[PDB]
């Protein structure tokens, strides 16, 4: 569980690259699982 800006979500996938994938959170190239996301402006900071 984490919060990011909405544009970064495209990096939350097996074998991806970019700022989040390089420096915060990465999935293995053979990941088994689900990625779930939503806009949360009640937290908008």
């Amino acid at each position: 569980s984490f919060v990011i800006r909405g544009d970064e979500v495209r990096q939350i996938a097996p074998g991806q690259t970019g700022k989040i994938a390089d420096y915060n959170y990465k999935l293995p190239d053979d990941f088994t699982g689900c990625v779930i996301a939503w806009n949360s402006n009640n937290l908008d900071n």
Partner: protein, 50 residues
């Protein structure tokens, strides 16, 4: 040309090995036949498909 049977064994062994080496240069539909191009031009998820 009297020994054409023995010269055929020599020629067929050479032709088969030359074809086996030449087939390294073919694409087979891949982006390049050079394996280090694919690994340097593409990210892993695309490179493994190529």
């Amino acid at each position: 040309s009297a020994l054409g049977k023995l010269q055929n064994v020599v020629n067929q062994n050479a032709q088969a090995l030359n074809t086996l080496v030449k087939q390294l240069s073919s694409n087979f539909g891949a982006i390049s036949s050079v394996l280090n191009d694919i690994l340097s031009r593409l990210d892993k998820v695309e490179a493994e498909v190529q």
